[PDB]
Amino acid sequence: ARTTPIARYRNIGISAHIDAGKTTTTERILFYTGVNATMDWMEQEQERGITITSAATTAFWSGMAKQYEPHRINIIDTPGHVDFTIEVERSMRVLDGAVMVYCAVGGVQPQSETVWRQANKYKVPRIAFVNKMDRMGANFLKVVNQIKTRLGANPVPLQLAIGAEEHFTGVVDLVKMKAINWNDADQGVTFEYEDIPADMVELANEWHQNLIESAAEASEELMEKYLGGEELTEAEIKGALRQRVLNNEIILVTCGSAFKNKGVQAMLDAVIDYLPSPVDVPAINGILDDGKDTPAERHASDDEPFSALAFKIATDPFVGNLTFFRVYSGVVNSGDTVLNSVKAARERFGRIVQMHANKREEIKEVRAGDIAAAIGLKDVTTGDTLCDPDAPIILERMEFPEPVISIAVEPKTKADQEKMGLALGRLAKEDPSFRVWTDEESNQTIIAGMGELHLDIIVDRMKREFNVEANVGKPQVAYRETIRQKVTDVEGKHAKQSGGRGQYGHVVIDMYPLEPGSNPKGYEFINDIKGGVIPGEYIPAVDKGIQEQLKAGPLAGYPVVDMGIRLHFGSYHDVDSSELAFKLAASIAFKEGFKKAKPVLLEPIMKVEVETPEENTGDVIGDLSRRRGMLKGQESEVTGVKIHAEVPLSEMFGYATQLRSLTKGRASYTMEFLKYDEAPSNVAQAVIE
Amino acid sequence: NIKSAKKRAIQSEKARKHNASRRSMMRTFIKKVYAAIEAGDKAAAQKAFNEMQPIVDRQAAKGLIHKNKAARHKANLTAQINKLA
């Protein structure tokens, strides 16, 4: 129909290291915005007391001083942790601003590093909030300095703390140069906007004067007057730094103590002050359908053709499938029939809901620059584009973190087996960073996720939401078998003088080993037969014969690999010999030859590439060695150090978990199959079926 | 249940209570007549019979007994009050 505010939209996401307060502070907002509802409402996430899934609400900030024309803010509180990073890839692709939280005590810390990289990956503007200023060991400026050093970024303290830890009373707006006083009860609200105290005047008389100079560096004519010692107006500084915040060249820092209520509020102001509108933002990239590029563009316009991206999929018990989206362009009304471009199927919008702090309010229309959940949409997975069917476009689609941990699961009670297939399937489409498949060999169900905890609460989600408990183990291994010695002329024979068809077979051969040559074969059959000792028509079966035993060798089943066999001698009856008769002799020929060929158990090795900080390339190297692993290089890739190693599969299980422990959480790795090598004796004799 | 035609329930309760005491009384007079019949006291029977007739007859009109019951009662009681009394 009409709509109301528009362009005064603030799409921000809060994210940070664990604890930090990146959810306490989110609830605090809701209180202040909501003058006149915990974001950890998952059962599992209340028991454990940690954000597991990103929680979205919207609320209206009138500005703490009454100062502002009321703005509509779309907030998204996200996980700290890792394991569920996907909940930040998405929770950062889509929205416009970002409030990076930091613990007054715990500095940057490893998972601050990760969410930072993710902000850059999507070039999202940002400010900063140093929480917990009331805690033992608090040091505002230290963290400020760390943002610069540890994240190699450009911080600009937009503020200053009034004391620290148990003596933390308020803050200094070092723009309007006053020491905001939050009071006793009413938690926040009020002010008395008090002036700087005598204590901090000298420090306060900085601003980081390279604030006004970092405001200066906005535009030269904005500093030309600064050069002439012309004190710039309060209004043109806010515009200046914002200009540069909006250009990711600078990060304003704010600080506070959500627990003590002395701070959250100034930060909200700082959101509208310096964080983007949906229009102060690059229009979207993308493609056309079959055709080619052109960025879809789609300017942030109510009067453009509708286009939105689907992030995050859920299922509420009472209203069904929820499908969250960010409308970049155009508009959808309740009943419009939009297009899923990346599936080439159309969907019909029906009900629409905005999670509204503490009430699922219903809506009939959804404009650009807003987010919401569409009820009932049939086949919409995460990353899909929902555009106008007449003006069709694929959008960029964030990235899918790709799992680091794998595990075999069996359904405890044989009945549940069916139910597992279902539930693992459901949890899969919800969470693209989780994966499930069935081992093409050794048919066991295998799940894989971004970590120990990740898998934990997946499994935990099976029990809770599908009443499927299943226990867990280390995956089985696909071993192989071969021989070591080239064995000379071994004799396989048949002779069936019984009661009907004669059936006689005689074959003499050499079973010699091979090297990992020719991709398809791994098996070489030579017809070095004499003049015609065996007719060329019974020569296809002896080959076929041998083919049969290669499927599960005599050591412990398992495929037989890298084998060569030569024909030399044989014999037949002018009739009694046969298709079968030599095929069996070959079978007998394979045995005995195999017994006498010194058989050995092969195991699969991986080409392993670890990417790690320079600080502990020793520990990692060492662990690789400890895992019976072979090393082959180190590159020294820019900032980390790519470490190359060949290490056996049956030993890399749960690698991710310890690599994490060894490297403070900063260390990718990757693997794929490389070859089959001899298993150490202790291994071999153990692998016994 | 949350439909104001629940006042219907509260009304019909008043109704039962009304019908309760009247139909109680009516019966206790029909009781009295048989008391004579059983006692043998031929006079007391007509005394009460003629005492209950107005009750029973009225109650048929009031519609808490409806016609032929009132008919039947005094009908066969007549047929008994003078079978020795």
Binding site: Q417, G421, T438, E440, N443, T445 | -
Partner: protein
Amino acid sequence: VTSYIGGEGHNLQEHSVILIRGGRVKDLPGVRYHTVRGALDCSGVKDRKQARSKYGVKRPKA
């Protein structure tokens, strides 16, 4: 019950979800059903062109 998997090549393994069609095989006694290619986890036949409706193979982009 046991069911045929017609067509050249297939996926299908231990925990696949499939769709049974009914239809016997005069060569496999006790096999009295077909698997319906291209429904649920059962992929269609690779590169098949004639009779793709069976074997669940979509029209090769004309």
